[PDB]
Design a binder for this molecule. Structure first.
Ligand code: HEM
Ligand SMILES: C[C@]12CCC(=O)C=C1CC[C@@H]1[C@@H]2CC[C@]2(C)C(=O)CC[C@@H]12
Length: 452
């Protein structure tokens, strides 16, 4: 088949579509273009043709095969934030990506995934005892902030473990994300007029310089170390690889950054949304609390419990299905291929619209939040919240551990009330790189009233 999508009006087609992406934001533009044209269609971002695709079949082919193991985005933008051929998240050099990824993969599985379950619990506990740090006079908790801080403290104590300023680094991480989101698909024109992006350049410097301090200390501690054998972790694994010659200081420093931001960026927003669903779905809240009593009682959360928490597992999956945070995934073709019906040349950008896909394909009641959607074992080829295959989410397994850990230890101790009528549906969202609340609005706080 020939490809659906708007006309190439002697080079005005490309201009409107890119501009539409800039105006609407990536995610809403993907949804616009999927709803107007097919569930498989073509658009342009900068010059290059970018396929925006919600068909499960296409998605599955793409993530399965090794010749889509790349992403895309402004070279000048990625250079600006330091992800150009450097980290893994948007590191599009195939070979350099290939050598860096395994470090992350080791750190996010095996023993580190078991350690996580208690690290995550103790970090939330410690923050719930310091709830004055994040609560109003009116008793309104700034959940988003709370979550970001525990996500950071968790990430630090597992992957780096150098003392740091949670409160400050969290703010800087938000700054970095904003920049990342801003510059990812800006046309080169934008970077010439340089009183238009110095704003962001400084947010990046703030975070990058804050982490240099920490990695510098981490470097110091490693050199003057007794049992180097015993106390291994992500940051160290990398630093020793540099100390061989496997990695570059610049690259190390970006990986350590990329590991620290990952959870604060995405987990915190997901759990936030999950908390607003628990608030407005008391039917489900009871089921979860019953399960916690049955399975855990008043014992500390432990790795062996997490498989048993089958209801909460389904709650999480359904929350990510209904109200995703990461609803779209950017890939790129590295070899030519036919994909379902259509031909896809190499160098072709791809945006998999997984959020739309989760409402069009497999589920019984796609457009409403129900655990009936996960009442029968869902095949992984109809529901990819993390993606899969050679470039799927490195955190996918540990992420589920962390989300169960924090929801248990929070809901164990507190009923959660949402202010006013507010629910996830009524929250005003930005829908650009990810799907997250608009924080210039308010009524995003919650109220935490005890149990027992
Ligand atoms: C609710 C939690 C999370 C969701 C929904 C999520 C989702 C995703 C998705 C959809 C991707 C794109 C994968 C693809 O292209 O197929 C991704 C990539 C990634 N995620 Fe996550 N993620 C989450 C948490 C985490 C955490 C906690 C970490 C690390 C601590 C992490 C690290 C990464 C990394 C490193 C990549 C890039 C993989 C690569 O390009 O090689 N994620 N994630
Ligand atoms: C999960 C993630 C990485 C860790 C992090 O810190 C923040 C995000 C949110 C944006 C995700 C990204 C992974 C790559 C994604 C899926 C894309 O291809 C487009 C959106 C983007």
């Amino acid at each position: 088949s020939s490809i659906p999508g708007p006309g190439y009006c002697m080079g005005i087609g490309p201009l409107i579509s890119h501009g539409r992406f800039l105006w609407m934001g990536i995610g809403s533009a993907c949804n616009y273009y999927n709803r107007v044209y097919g569930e498989f269609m073509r658009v342009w971002i900068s010059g290059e043709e970018t396929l925006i695709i919600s068909k499960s079949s296409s998605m599955f082919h793409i993530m399965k095969h090794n010749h889509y193991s790349s992403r895309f985005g402004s070279k000048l933008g990625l250079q600006c934030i330091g992800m150009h051929e450097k980290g893994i998240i948007f590191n599009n050099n195939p070979e350099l990506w290939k050598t860096t990824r395994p470090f992350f993969m080791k750190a996010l599985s095996g023993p580190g995934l078991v350690r996580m379950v208690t690290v995550c619990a103790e970090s939330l506990k410690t923050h719930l005892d310091r709830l004055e740090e994040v609560t109003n006079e009116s008793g309104y908790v700034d959940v988003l902030t709370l979550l970001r801080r525990v996500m950071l403290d968790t990430s630090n104590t597992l992957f780096l473990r150098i003392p740091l300023d949670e409160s400050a680094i969290v703010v800087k991480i938000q700054g970095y994300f904003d920049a990342w989101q801003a510059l990812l698909i800006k046309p080169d024109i934008f970077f010439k007029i340089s009183w238009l992006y110095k704003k962001y350049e400084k947010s990046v410097k703030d975070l990058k310089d804050a982490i240099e301090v920490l990695i510098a200390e981490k470097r110091r501690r490693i050199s003057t170390e007794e049992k180097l054998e015993e106390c291994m972790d992500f940051a160290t694994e990398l630093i020793l690889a540099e100390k061989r010659g496997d990695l570059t200081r610049e690259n190390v420093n970006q990986c350590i950054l990329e590991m620290l931001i990952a959870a604060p960026d995405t987990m915190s927003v997901s759990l936030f949304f999950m908390l607003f669903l628990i608030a407005k779905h008391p039917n489900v809240e009871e089921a979860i609390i019953k399960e916690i009593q049955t399975v855990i009682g008043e014992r500390d959360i432990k790795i062996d419990d997490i498989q048993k928490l089958k209801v909460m597992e389904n709650f999480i999956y359904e929350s990510m299905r209904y109200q995703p945070v990461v609803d779209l995934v950017m890939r790129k073709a590295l070899e030519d291929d036919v994909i379902d019906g259509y031909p896809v040349k190499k160098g072709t950008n791809i945006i998999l619209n997984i959020g739309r896909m989760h409402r069009l394909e497999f589920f019984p009641k796609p457009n409403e939040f129900t655990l009936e959607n996960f009442a029968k074992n869902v095949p992984y080829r109809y529901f990819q919240p993390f993606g899969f295959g050679p470039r799927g989410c490195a955190g996918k397994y540990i992420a589920m551990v962390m989300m169960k850990a924090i929801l248990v230890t929070l809901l164990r101790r507190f009923h959660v009330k949402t202010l006013q009528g507010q629910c996830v549906e009524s929250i005003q969202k930005i829908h650009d790189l990810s799907l997250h609340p608009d924080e210039t609005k308010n009524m995003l706080e919650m109220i935490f009233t005890p149990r027992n």
